[PDB]
Design a binder for this molecule. Structure first.
Ligand SMILES: CCCCCCCCCCCCCCCCCC(=O)OC[C@H](COP(=O)([O-])OCC(O)COP(=O)([O-])OC[C@@H](COC(=O)CCCCCCCCCCCCCCCCC)OC(=O)CCCCCCCCCCCCCCCCC)OC(=O)CCCCCCCCCCCCCCCCC
Ligand SMILES: NC(=O)c1ccc[n+]([C@@H]2O[C@H](COP(=O)([O-])OP(=O)(O)OC[C@H]3O[C@@H](n4cnc5c(N)ncnc54)[C@H](O)[C@@H]3O)[C@@H](O)[C@H]2O)c1
Lengths: 417, 60
């Protein structure tokens, strides 16, 4: 019946920049407007890893096919797409130039570029991750691995001895709570110390560059540090990983507080991939300070250039940059964009809700849910000390969540509400 | 000079107690799932292999 909209145009009315959350919004945008508008999508990476099930993926409760998704699958068939990143953006002219060099016009811009990973912030880190034997592990898989490479799952298993370091980069970084696996490894490494698999002379410390683990929710941040002390894990703040020497297994850390660097021997290194602010978003005068989008906390509309929006991780919102937060940010964007296409007012407000599971044990978890003011709901930090209630909620997220992201990208299942 | 006539093509296996040590038990078999709990981990720790464990449970 309906003919596919064209991609060989000079201008559009809505333009989504991103595939992870920019694709789900476009799929939810067109279905609400019944395809009244012709929109274009321009992402940068061909593969979207489901970091929300990263820890069940490391436990191999999720196959690699259910963790690796293409970017085209998030976008519907009616709308055209192209894997070309934007080179520069002209908000005063309402146009966007791609890396190829073709100028494309727009009436509304939805920026979902998120936080771009930068492996080059740590010298030699990427090459030590891609190596199929080196004990350097990371938060995401390199794209050069085949389907038979399962090094990601050997971080907890192959820790027979040595010094172990869990490195947290400088905020803002992607995957704050959803990639915290120091509680599941502690329980498994407690078993290894019982029957001798783990040597009694081993060291594990959390190298956190920031001062706190959860920035915008102090209720959950106090719980983490309280539980880390009860477990016995040592934490070092204001220290960030700087260089990884693959030859002698040396890790260069630097205390950003005092500017003092040191060299430490490691045998099991895990680091969350650090982010990097994209320079073109600063040349166009859209970001502020740290490099995040300066938009309204309520309507997600930018301060200036009211035709430009922002959501996901790239937006500067006083909340945890999770995926369930994006479920409630696409409903607001697809609404307010619909209102500016008709000149109407903006009645969609974002309350700052964000939900992320915190794996407190090998097979138990608790939910970190909070509003804009850091206040949690009925689920916040409940059944946190393990038990049947915590065990059932774990199996529902480990065995029954990865199969749901297929419907999210297709369009069969919408957000929670 | 027996090592001069030794054939290194037999190094494809490392046989010890009738078991090949270069066996990818982390990707194949009952030992592949990393979500095993304390009991299953301690059980594989004792026998080190699935072939020996299954052989004993056959009679037990
Ligand atoms: C009932 C009639 C009895 C008649 C007589 C029978 C004879 C009895 C005497 C002999 C006893 C049996 C001996 C068996 C051992 C033989 C040797 C052997 O084979 O190796 C060990 C063998 C190892 O098993 P496995 O296959 O390797 O384990 C699976 C994985 O490998 C393990 O993987 P894992 O370790 O990594 O993780 C395991 C688990 C994680 O598990 C844990 O971590 C938990 C561990 C907690 C330990 C806590 C320790 C506490 C210490 C004590 C308490 C502290 C002190 C308290 C002080 C109090 C003070 C008073 O994780 C999971 O996710 C579990 C999967 C989901 C749960 C599946 C449960 C199925 C239940 C179905 C029935 C439901 C009925 C509910 C009704 C409830 C009310 C009755 O153990 C067993 O065989 C257990 C028996 C199983 C028999 C199955 C056949 C029957 C089917 C179940 C019954 C169905 C209902 C029937 C009645 C219905 C009408 C009522
Ligand atoms: N743990 C992690 O490292 C990680 C990484 C990404 C997403 N996530 C999870 O997913 C949630 C939402 O992810 P997200 O969508 O906000 O980030 P994202 O990186 O997944 O999405 C960014 C998209 O925009 C594209 N992009 C980036 N720069 C671009 C440029 N110059 N030009 C054109 N396209 C560009 C990317 O290709 C990508 O399709 C997050 O809240 C988080 O929970 C986690």
């Amino acid at each position: 019946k309906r003919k596919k909209t064209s991609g060989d145009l000079d201008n559009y009315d809505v333009l989504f920049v991103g595939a992870n959350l920019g694709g789900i919004c476009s799929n939810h945008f067109d279905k609400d407007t019944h395809g009244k508008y012709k929109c274009f999508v321009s992402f940068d990476q061909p593969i979207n890893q489901i970091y929300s099930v990263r820890i069940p993926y490391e436990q191999q409760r999720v196959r690699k096919s259910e963790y690796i998704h293409f970017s085209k699958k998030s976008i519907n068939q009616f709308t055209p797409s192209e894997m070309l990143a934007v080179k520069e953006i002209l908000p005063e002219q309402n146009a966007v130039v791609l890396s190829s060099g073709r100028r494309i016009g727009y009436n509304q811009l939805v920026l979902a570029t998120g936080l771009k990973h930068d492996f080059s912030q740590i010298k030699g880190f990427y090459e030590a991750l891609e190596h199929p034997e080196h004990p350097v592990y990371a938060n995401r898989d390199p794209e050069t691995w085949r389907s038979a490479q399962h090094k990601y799952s050997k971080y907890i298993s192959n820790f027979k001895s040595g010094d172990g370091y869990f490195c947290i980069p400088e905020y803002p970084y992607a995957g704050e709570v959803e990639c915290f696996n120091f509680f599941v490894s502690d329980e498994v490494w407690k078993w290894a110390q019982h029957h001798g698999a783990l040597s009694p002379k081993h060291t594990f410390t959390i190298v956190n560059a920031n001062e706190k683990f959860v920035h915008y929710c102090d209720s959950a941040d106090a719980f983490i540090k309280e539980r880390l002390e009860k477990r016995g894990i040592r934490v070092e703040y204001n220290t960030k990983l700087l260089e990884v020497h693959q030859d002698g297994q040396k890790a260069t850390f630097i205390n950003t507080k005092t500017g003092e660097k040191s060299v430490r021997d490691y045998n099991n290194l895990y680091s969350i991939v650090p982010s990097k602010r994209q320079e073109f978003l600063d040349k166009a005068g859209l970001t502020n300070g740290n490099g995040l989008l300066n938009v309204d906390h309520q309507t997600l509309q930018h301060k200036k250039y009211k035709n430009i929006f922002g959501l996901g991780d790239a937006a500067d919102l006083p909340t945890t940059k999770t995926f369930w937060a994006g479920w409630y940010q696409i409903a607001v964007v697809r609404n307010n964009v619909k209102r500016n296409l008709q000149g109407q007012t903006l009645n969609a407000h974002y309350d700052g809700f964000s939900k992320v599971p915190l794996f407190t044990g090998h097979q138990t978890l608790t939910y970190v849910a909070h509003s804009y003011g850091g206040v949690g709901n009925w689920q916040h930090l409940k059944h946190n000390n393990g038990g049947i209630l915590a065990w059932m909620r774990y199996r529902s997220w480990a065995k029954g969540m990865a199969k749901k992201f297929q419907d999210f990208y297709n369009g069969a299942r919408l957000g929670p509400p | 000079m027996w090592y001069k006539y030794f054939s290194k093509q037999s190094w494809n296996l490392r046989v010890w107690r009738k078991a090949n040590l270069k066996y990818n038990q982390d990707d194949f078999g009952m030992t592949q799932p990393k979500y095993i709990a304390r009991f299953g981990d301690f059980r594989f720790r004792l026998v080190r292999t699935e072939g020996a464990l299954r052989g004993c449970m056959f009679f037990v």
